[PDB]
Design a binder for this molecule. Structure first.
Ligand SMILES: CN[C@@H]1[C@@H](O)[C@@H](O[C@@H]2[C@@H](O)[C@H](O[C@H]3O[C@H](CN)CC[C@H]3N)[C@@H](N)C[C@H]2N)OC[C@]1(C)O
Ligand SMILES: CN[C@@H]1[C@@H](O)[C@@H](O[C@@H]2[C@@H](O)[C@H](O[C@H]3O[C@H](CN)CC[C@H]3N)[C@@H](N)C[C@H]2N)OC[C@]1(C)O
Ligand SMILES: [Mg+2]
Ligand SMILES: [Mg+2]
Ligand SMILES: [Mg+2]
Ligand SMILES: [Mg+2]
Ligand SMILES: [Mg+2]
Ligand SMILES: [Mg+2]
Ligand SMILES: [Mg+2]
Ligand SMILES: [Mg+2]
Ligand SMILES: [Mg+2]
Ligand SMILES: [Mg+2]
Ligand SMILES: [Mg+2]
Ligand SMILES: [Mg+2]
Ligand SMILES: [Mg+2]
Ligand SMILES: [Mg+2]
Ligand SMILES: [Mg+2]
Ligand SMILES: [Mg+2]
Ligand SMILES: [Mg+2]
Ligand SMILES: [Mg+2]
Ligand SMILES: [Mg+2]
Ligand SMILES: [Mg+2]
Ligand SMILES: [Mg+2]
Ligand SMILES: [Mg+2]
Ligand SMILES: [Mg+2]
Ligand SMILES: [Mg+2]
Ligand SMILES: [Mg+2]
Ligand SMILES: [Mg+2]
Ligand SMILES: [Mg+2]
Ligand SMILES: [Mg+2]
Ligand SMILES: [Mg+2]
Ligand SMILES: [Mg+2]
Ligand SMILES: [Mg+2]
Ligand SMILES: [Mg+2]
Ligand SMILES: [Mg+2]
Ligand SMILES: [Mg+2]
Ligand SMILES: [Mg+2]
Ligand SMILES: [Mg+2]
Ligand SMILES: [Mg+2]
Ligand SMILES: [Mg+2]
Ligand SMILES: [Mg+2]
Ligand SMILES: [Mg+2]
Ligand SMILES: [Mg+2]
Ligand SMILES: [Mg+2]
Ligand SMILES: [Mg+2]
Ligand SMILES: [Mg+2]
Ligand SMILES: [Mg+2]
Ligand SMILES: [Mg+2]
Ligand SMILES: [Mg+2]
Ligand SMILES: [Mg+2]
Ligand SMILES: [Mg+2]
Ligand SMILES: [Zn+2]
Ligand SMILES: [Zn+2]
Lengths: 135, 252, 77, 112, 97, 91
RNA sequence: UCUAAGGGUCGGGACGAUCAACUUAGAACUGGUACGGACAAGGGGAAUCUGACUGUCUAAUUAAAACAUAGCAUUGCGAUGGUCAGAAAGUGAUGUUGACGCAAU
RNA sequence: GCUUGUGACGGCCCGUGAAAAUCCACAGGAAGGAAUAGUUUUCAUGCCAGGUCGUACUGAUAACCGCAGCAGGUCUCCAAG
RNA sequence: GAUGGGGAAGCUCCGUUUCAAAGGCCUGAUUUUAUGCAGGCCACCAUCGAAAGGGAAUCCGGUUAAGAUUCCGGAACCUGGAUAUGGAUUCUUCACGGUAACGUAACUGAAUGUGGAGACGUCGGCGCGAGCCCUGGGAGGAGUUAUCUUUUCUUCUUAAC
């Protein structure tokens, strides 16, 4: 259809976040005075959670579940749309033009997105988004 | 009196192959579970020039079945094999230019290269630039395969013996005139010390059988028996015939 | 082997640790287009590098020579 | 008009004797030995000289800080990143097209 | 012939040429059908494939090269992928396609 | 202006070696230097070096060819007898 | 002693100003008709014999028409093989080779 | 302009023109790690050490080889008007 | 060219990964205590062989009857080892930033796998660099000066890092 829309997951193809799966949030179909080009606003996963097993102890799993996020403006051309989708929900308000340009908002935004992703990950809703793409 | 040139050669002081620049000994994969039972895939990484070889070489990396590692092999590139192509090894691989299949696993009429004389020897027959063999029939009982070699002779081999589809690259070298001595010079620089050749009759009789005489001439039949002796054998050696060949070649 | 801009950093260097010796150089130099002027160079001998600060006008210089602590043995020219 | 001599006991013009001619505070010409220009590293995938990476000779790379010897993206000091972009698309598409083919077996399994 | 349909799409209709633009079409969805030159690589095939399934756009594989599919649009260079924006007078997509 | 009536690339060898051999070479030197079309990127940027080895200027595809020409007669007429031969075991 | 041609760099609400070179051609005049003024620097032509050619050799009497070459032809060999080495070997050269190959004329 | 270095290119091949020590990096994710504080040496600054053998001079119409302070022979760098 | 080996009456000949049971490291486990046992690695199997090949790192000034990239003065660099303070990192634990190419004073990483550099012909023109060559102004010094010549000659430099 137009697969650029809120819920869509994509794979970042460039720019230090490359290889990590992001969910779109606020697609700006056309441009802006700064970024004059089609760009999404994505909440991604930087440091993925690790493998877990039946023998993984109490705090081991409590450790291995932690997740480092990131929040990125992406040229559409630097995204590779996945068929998969994860529904935005809590971070609809988090990820916005305002959050960027000052760090104080990004940091708290990442904090939310942190609690957001871990909560969806435990109780493995949207399993693909947290499974590391390997190349 | 003396020791003739071809005699001196088996000692190999100056007569050993000029080996320094060569990509490696070109061989098939070792025959293992994958090849003799299933197939296994590899990519030819680059194809490359061997020194003193007319045939290009394909470097083909596979994965190691029993340990994590990449195992690179040296193949004689059949014509059409290209960097980035996937090559397939063993029985259940399909029939395409470049793969390597047991002789039993191809139909008759297949044209195939670098084939083993015995299964697992990692390839012998038709490795020269442009050569190849043709399968003529099989014998599924005591699985055998008959093949026509580059020389034209036909041979029975085992159907477990492999060989690689297609013809060797670099065919056609022997048409272009060498055109001068330098081209012949550098041709043998990177081969071994064969060049140039002094004619046995230009020598003195201590040097050669053909040596000696107040005219340059051979003075006895230049055809020498099989049962001759080292330093007796220079000439047309155990020749069944001699003289200009008239009429057609291409035996039965 | 290094040159220094910051006047303050220079001071924290002049009192620093293993710095037992400094030196001060004065060069006749012609300012900008026309005239001459008194240029002064502050050289501090470190254990690895010799850091040096060039104070262009003699005003900042005059007050800085005072900014040098004692027990720093300073060769004048 | 000044003529110069080698500074080391090797008289011969080999790779390692390269000589820059120089004028010193003395005001005379003097030889100085130059090392061999070190070559830019190459992307281990495509082979192009990979940017962001300092070019020195190999034991010098142990005397330098790591922000020289890598760049900020995965496969930083290794592949040229249009080649890593390649590894991105190709990975994803091949791991995707896998599922399709695992699905289409599960069709032809009971639907044959 | 399948080539002659393009003759009509080209004069009487809207189209774009080349990978970088035929992704912009599929992204915005503006493309009804894209056509692929047989020799183009499979990573680009799968991409242009997968970009199409997400845009619900049919794709037909032109049998021939890029120097031909470019002549088939009457342009003097080579093109791997033509994206069909607005169908012309021709029947085009309603076909075998 | 046109330069040589006959010899062309062979004028390098001057008067030497006899005319037959010179021409007999001319064919193959012209075969081996030529720019060829590339099966992959569809450009005429294929060219030789190291007889038997043909690469594309761009696109960096490299194919094992004939000695003085990319596709040798016996090659393709073998390759197509391979195609026909697998169809037998396709059907 | 002159003439002509062959350039760089600027700004534009048709060109100008400016920097820099030693090429080429042409014209005058001039002389004990001399002037590539020393130095430097092919003699040319017509034929017979012979080797195609560049290459090579008798250090210390032969540099050739002799050797070598590209080219032409012939012979052997499918590895349990050809040719060749060692007293022998559980040893070796060709051989990191495979007839568009190696070996012998 | 001359010597030399280097760069991007093109010609050449039945010639396509070393090896190893070595050094860096990527992949990976064992493991270890904070809040009364935990982490770090690939950032800075600082402290100690670096042995053994050779080092003179000739290198050629006298320092070498040719019985010699022999018109012979003996590898190479620099190179003004 | 040693070695288990195989020849050879023997001096010795062959063989260098070869019909060979061919070892060496990272950590714990000691808290009798100094290092046995716990792992998991790695099985790659002498050594000689380049004062022109490969290669960690220094320069300038001064100095002797004779030595100097070696001494002296000054300014550096590499390597091995010890280590402390600052800076950085973190309550979103293992840095942020830029669409991207990439940035940076730092910004954990074992087994194992991979990649690059070591690391490579030749000839041709074309671009650039250094040093040399020619040269204008001026500041010094010396030469010629019956005549001529704002003239002839010379100093006017800048190392590694
Ligand atoms: C004062 N000069 C320096 C001092 O600053 C300090 O420098 C070390 C330096 O030797 C290290 O470097 C060393 O160790 C590296 C591996 N750890 C490899 C390269 C090696 N030079 C740096 N990584 C950290 C500095 N603080 O320790 C060594 C020194 C020479 O004393
Ligand atoms: C190898 N070159 C040789 C060169 O060695 C020399 O050969 C003479 C040789 O002709 C002399 O020998 C001659 O005279 C001898 C006395 N009458 C008898 C033998 C005869 N050949 C011998 N003394 C050896 C060489 N110095 O002069 C002849 C030559 C062929 O050029
Ligand atoms: Mg269990
Ligand atoms: Mg004898
Ligand atoms: Mg192998
Ligand atoms: Mg022929
Ligand atoms: Mg010879
Ligand atoms: Mg001969
Ligand atoms: Mg002969
Ligand atoms: Mg004779
Ligand atoms: Mg005899
Ligand atoms: Mg005779
Ligand atoms: Mg004769
Ligand atoms: Mg005869
Ligand atoms: Mg006889
Ligand atoms: Mg010296
Ligand atoms: Mg000097
Ligand atoms: Mg960098
Ligand atoms: Mg340092
Ligand atoms: Mg950098
Ligand atoms: Mg012409
Ligand atoms: Mg006259
Ligand atoms: Mg004359
Ligand atoms: Mg005459
Ligand atoms: Mg004459
Ligand atoms: Mg001759
Ligand atoms: Mg000549
Ligand atoms: Mg000779
Ligand atoms: Mg003689
Ligand atoms: Mg002669
Ligand atoms: Mg003839
Ligand atoms: Mg026998
Ligand atoms: Mg034999
Ligand atoms: Mg026999
Ligand atoms: Mg033939
Ligand atoms: Mg030179
Ligand atoms: Mg090359
Ligand atoms: Mg990593
Ligand atoms: Mg600092
Ligand atoms: Mg000396
Ligand atoms: Mg001396
Ligand atoms: Mg003498
Ligand atoms: Mg003497
Ligand atoms: Mg003597
Ligand atoms: Mg021995
Ligand atoms: Mg040694
Ligand atoms: Mg050396
Ligand atoms: Mg050294
Ligand atoms: Mg001296
Ligand atoms: Mg930082
Ligand atoms: Mg490793
Ligand atoms: Zn790349
Ligand atoms: Zn191509």
């Amino acid at each position: 259809a137009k697969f650029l829309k809120a819920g869509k997951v994509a794979v970042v193809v460039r720019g230090r976040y490359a290889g990590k799966k992001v969910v779109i949030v606020k697609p700006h179909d056309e441009g802006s005075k700064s970024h004059p080009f089609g760009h999404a606003l994505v909440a991604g996963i930087e440091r993925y959670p690790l493998k877990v097993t039946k023998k993984h102890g109490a705090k081991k799993v409590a450790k291995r579940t932690k997740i480092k996020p990131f929040i990125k403006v992406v040229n559409y051309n630097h995204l590779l749309p996945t068929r998969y989708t994860l529904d935005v929900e809590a971070f609809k308000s988090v990820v916005s033009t305002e959050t960027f340009e000052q760090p104080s908002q990004r940091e708290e935004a990442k904090k939310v997105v942190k609690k957001a992703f871990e909560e969806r990950h435990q109780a493995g809703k949207n399993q693909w988004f947290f499974s590391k793409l390997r190349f | 009196g003396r020791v003739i040139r071809n005699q001196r050669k088996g000692a190999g002081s100056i007569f050993t192959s000029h080996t320094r620049l060569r990509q490696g000994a070109a061989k098939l994969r070792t025959l293992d579970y994958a090849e003799r039972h299933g197939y296994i895939r590899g990519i030819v990484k680059q194809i490359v020039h061997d020194s003193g070889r007319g045939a290009p070489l394909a470097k083909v990396v596979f994965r190691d079945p029993y340990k994590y590692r990449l195992r690179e092999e040296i193949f004689i590139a059949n014509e059409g094999v290209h960097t980035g192509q996937f090559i397939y090894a063993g029985k259940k691989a399909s029939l395409n230019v470049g793969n390597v299949l047991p002789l039993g696993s191809v139909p008759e009429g297949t044209i195939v290269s670098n084939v083993e004389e015995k299964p697992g020897d990692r390839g012998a027959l038709a490795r020269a630039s442009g050569n190849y063999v043709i399968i003529i029939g099989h014998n599924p009982d005591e699985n055998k395969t008959r093949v026509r070699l580059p020389s034209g002779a036909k041979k029975v081999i085992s159907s477990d013996a492999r060989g690689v589809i297609g013809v060797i690259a670099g065919g056609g070298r022997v048409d272009k005139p060498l055109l001068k001595a330098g081209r012949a010079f550098h041709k043998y620089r990177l081969k071994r010390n064969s060049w140039p050749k002094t004619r046995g009759v230009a020598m003195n009789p201590v040097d050669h059988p053909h040596g000696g005489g107040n005219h340059q001439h051979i003075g006895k039949a230049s055809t020498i028996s099989r049962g001759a002796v080292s330093g007796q054998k220079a000439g047309l050696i155990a020749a069944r015939r001699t003289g200009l060949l008239r009429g057609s070649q291409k035996t039965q | 082997a290094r040159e220094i801009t910051d006047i303050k950093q220079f001071l924290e260097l002049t009192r620093r640790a293993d710095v037992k010796t400094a030196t001060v150089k004065i060069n006749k130099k012609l300012n900008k287009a026309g005239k001459p002027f008194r240029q002064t160079k502050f050289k501090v001998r470190g254990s690895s590098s010799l850091y040096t600060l060039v104070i262009n006008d003699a005003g900042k210089a005059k007050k800085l020579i005072q900014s040098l602590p004692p027990t720093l043995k300073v060769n004048r020219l | 008009a000044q003529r110069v001599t080698f500074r080391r006991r090797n008289p011969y013009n080999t790779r390692s004797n390269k000589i820059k001619v120089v004028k010193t505070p003395g005001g005379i010409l003097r030889a100085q030995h130059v090392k061999k220009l070190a070559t830019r590293p190459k992307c281990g995938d495509c082979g192009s000289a990979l940017q962001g990476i300092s070019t020195l000779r190999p034991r010098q790379y142990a005397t330098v800080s790591k922000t020289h010897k890598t760049v900020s993206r995965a496969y930083g000091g290794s592949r040229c990143a249009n080649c890593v972009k390649e590894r991105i698309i190709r990975a994803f598409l091949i791991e995707e097209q896998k599922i399709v083919k695992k699905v289409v077996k599960e069709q032809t399994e009971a639907a044959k | 012939s399948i080539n002659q349909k393009l003759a009509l799409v080209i004069k009487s209709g809207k189209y774009t040429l080349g990978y970088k633009s035929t992704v912009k079409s599929l992204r915005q969805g503006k493309s009804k059908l894209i056509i692929i030159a047989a020799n183009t690589p499979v990573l680009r095939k799968s991409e242009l494939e997968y970009y199409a399934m997400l845009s619900k756009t049919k794709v037909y594989y032109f049998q021939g090269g890029n120097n031909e599919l470019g002549t088939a649009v009457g342009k003097l260079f080579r093109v791997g992928v033509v994206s069909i924006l607005e169908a012309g007078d021709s029947d085009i997509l309603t076909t075998l396609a | 202006a046109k330069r040589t009536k006959k010899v062309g690339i062979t004028g390098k060898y001057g008067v030497r070696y006899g005319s037959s051999l010179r021409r007999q070479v001319k064919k193959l030197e012209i075969q081996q230097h030529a720019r060829y079309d590339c099966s992959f990127c569809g450009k005429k940027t294929v060219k030789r070096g190291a007889a038997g080895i043909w690469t594309c200027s761009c696109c960096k595809k490299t194919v094992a060819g004939g000695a003085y020409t990319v596709s040798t007669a016996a090659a393709a007429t073998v390759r197509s007898t391979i195609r026909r031969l697998r169809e037998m075991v396709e059907a």
